Amino acid sequence: YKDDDDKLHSQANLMRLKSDLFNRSPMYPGPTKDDPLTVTLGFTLQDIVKADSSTNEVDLVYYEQQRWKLNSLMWDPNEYGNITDFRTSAADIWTPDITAYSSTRPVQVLSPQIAVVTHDGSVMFIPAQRLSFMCDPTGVDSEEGATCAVKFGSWVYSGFEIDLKTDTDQVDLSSYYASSKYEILSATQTRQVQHYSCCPEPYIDVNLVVKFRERR
Template identity: 30%
Template structure:
């Protein structure tokens, strides 16, 4: 996950040519990440990890997390499920999904993975605020041979 934070900029020449820092994520602003249809009972990220902060204000944060969601399924059919994540002030870059770290499953074929960004206006204590959520649609197909052999 990457964003820019103008409050985290500095001039490297004034700071011994330091161009990036590893900063504990609980010491800086990070987006709220919440899985609405969570199957685990704990919808928030509970493990904080370091973020990489560059002198330009670019922040890269890769929190270790596993999201579990309920999906209706039939052992021999396709599964289509939706992950709804909430992130207040979350800037979603519509560059498509990055599957470079995807590891194919022995049990499932990934048919499609798409995402959509929604802005919603909610009344708040200080006036109306926009809240952003991102919906990920995931379509899987069980490999029939895997299911049959494991019966």
């Protein structure tokens, strides 16, 4: 029953932390040129569900791991009962506007929109998604298989406000559905920097390239 009090105190500690972080000097306005952010992206490809040769749309199911770090989300665990991290609704915090650049339907969200914040200010958010995107599956019924590609990146921030990185250029296939209609030959995820004549600012994306064929 002291165990009850210790539990009540841990709750108090976490609630205070959250109120201190979110309400005390409130909602972080997103990155700027004077305060840029790096977002790390990683894909875990679960399934190629559908490949439509009449419209050249392919549907993927994946988890997209997003990580970034804000000084405004830092705290000292010692001031809050040694709390080192917490789960919070993604609506409680700023999240990056990472967007598939060649989708053909709105992304469908398959996982709860909850993120983990750690005491150093780092945030991890892993939305599971079903995505329809522009892909010609010609060759999928061959040994060579088909190849498609889709870029992901911020919609509204240039490379001067949001930089992107990957930890590896290999997509995680370790949870790929073993009985999919389609087998994966390769899946890569590569940071690209784009440059345009009009504009001094660079544009950054991550190119997801998947080669696949009908599983015999």
